[PDB]
Design an enzyme around this catalytic site. Structure first.
Site, PDB file in Angstrom:
ATOM      1  N   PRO C   1      12.270 -30.774  20.488  1.00 11.11           N
ATOM      2  CA  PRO C   1      10.934 -30.147  20.278  1.00 11.11           C
ATOM      3  C   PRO C   1      10.792 -28.869  21.080  1.00 11.11           C
ATOM      4  O   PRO C   1      11.536 -28.641  22.018  1.00 11.11           O
ATOM      5  CB  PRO C   1       9.897 -31.151  20.741  1.00 11.11           C
ATOM      6  CG  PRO C   1      10.638 -32.468  20.517  1.00 11.11           C
ATOM      7  CD  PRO C   1      12.094 -32.171  20.921  1.00 11.11           C
ATOM      8  N   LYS C  32      10.456 -38.362  21.936  1.00  7.78           N
ATOM      9  CA  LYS C  32      11.691 -37.608  21.811  1.00  7.78           C
ATOM     10  C   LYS C  32      12.303 -37.527  23.200  1.00  7.78           C
ATOM     11  O   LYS C  32      11.592 -37.440  24.197  1.00  7.78           O
ATOM     12  CB  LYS C  32      11.407 -36.196  21.272  1.00  7.78           C
ATOM     13  CG  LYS C  32      10.996 -36.150  19.802  1.00  7.78           C
ATOM     14  CD  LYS C  32      12.202 -35.890  18.906  1.00  7.78           C
ATOM     15  CE  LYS C  32      11.804 -35.648  17.454  1.00  7.78           C
ATOM     16  NZ  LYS C  32      11.306 -36.883  16.779  1.00  7.78           N
ATOM     17  N   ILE C  64      10.869 -31.829  15.053  1.00 10.88           N
ATOM     18  CA  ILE C  64      11.357 -32.401  13.813  1.00 10.88           C
ATOM     19  C   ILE C  64      10.835 -33.823  13.953  1.00 10.88           C
ATOM     20  O   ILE C  64      11.452 -34.665  14.605  1.00 10.88           O
ATOM     21  CB  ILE C  64      12.887 -32.401  13.750  1.00 10.88           C
ATOM     22  CG1 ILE C  64      13.408 -30.962  13.823  1.00 10.88           C
ATOM     23  CG2 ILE C  64      13.359 -33.052  12.466  1.00 10.88           C
ATOM     24  CD1 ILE C  64      14.893 -30.868  13.887  1.00 10.88           C
TER      25      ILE C  64
END
Lengths: 113, 113, 113
Positions: C1, C32, C64
């Site tokens: 990210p 993440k 994502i």
């Protein structure tokens, strides 16, 4: 709305009324209150346009509404005239990306629109 | 097209041919004339990747692709080599967002594409 | 990210642990691993909000996955609380654009995701 620009010109070449005049123009063209308008200019950047380091810039104008294909042409004419007048950058040496945001993708005041 | 990169490396470590060489490279992979190519690098930025402040960078490559393929994987390989050979930045410490622009959303020379 | 932020506050006014705590927080809210988190803050910028250059900022959080309409308001509350605490910037003087990325248009290492 947010108008952000990156340029190779000098900071001392950005007039004292750049933020005010740009804030006014952005709000007036998108029909948004000035309190929601943010303007940013990042100067003295290493930037080449068309293979030359002469005065140039590229930026983005994003807003929830007010931006769409059937309106970006007018937005562009006004914004480019404004930037050419205040920063002296040639209109063929600037790019502006117009972005129509969805309220759900914008955080403000700790919440989203 | 527009290629803009942000990185934490010192401005002195950027090759003097970086802009010219990156501009030519971008026009090549995207098959766009250099007259429409813009390249920008913002150095000395406060940037952390993976929790460490070691050499890293992130950027975007935007272009109007229209009715054409993607090729982002091929673009990323060619771009990372370039950036890695020129900046020496580790390839596992760089992100590049590929953006396919719609002409109607791009302002240039006081008008839109 | 990637969390990238532009602000008018001074560079020295950014706490030495800003990158660290922000990186940890971003990784946490998006589920993440820190190893894929990049945090960037561009300070000392010429930026106005409502025409004023009093403390303000705007940024983008891209990932994502993890960013969706049903999740961004909670991300916003957490990020705005963090930024207001760390930077002292009023919450009504900051904007965050949430962007969910497709791995096909994200370059890392030498290919995409």
């Amino acid at each position: 709305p947010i108008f952000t620009l990156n340029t190779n010109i000098k900071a001392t070449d950005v007039p004292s009324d750049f933020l005010s005049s740009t804030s006014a123009l952005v709000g007036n063209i998108l029909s948004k209150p000035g309190s929601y308008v943010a303007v940013h200019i990042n100067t003295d950047q290493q930037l080449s346009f068309g293979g030359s380091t002469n005065p140039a810039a590229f930026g983005t104008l994003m807003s929830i509404g007010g931006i769409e294909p059937s309106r970006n042409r007018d937005h562009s004419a006004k914004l480019f005239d404004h930037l050419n007048t205040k920063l002296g950058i040639p209109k063929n040496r600037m790019y502006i990306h117009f972005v129509n945001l969805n309220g759900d993708d914008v955080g403000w005041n700790g919440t989203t629109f």
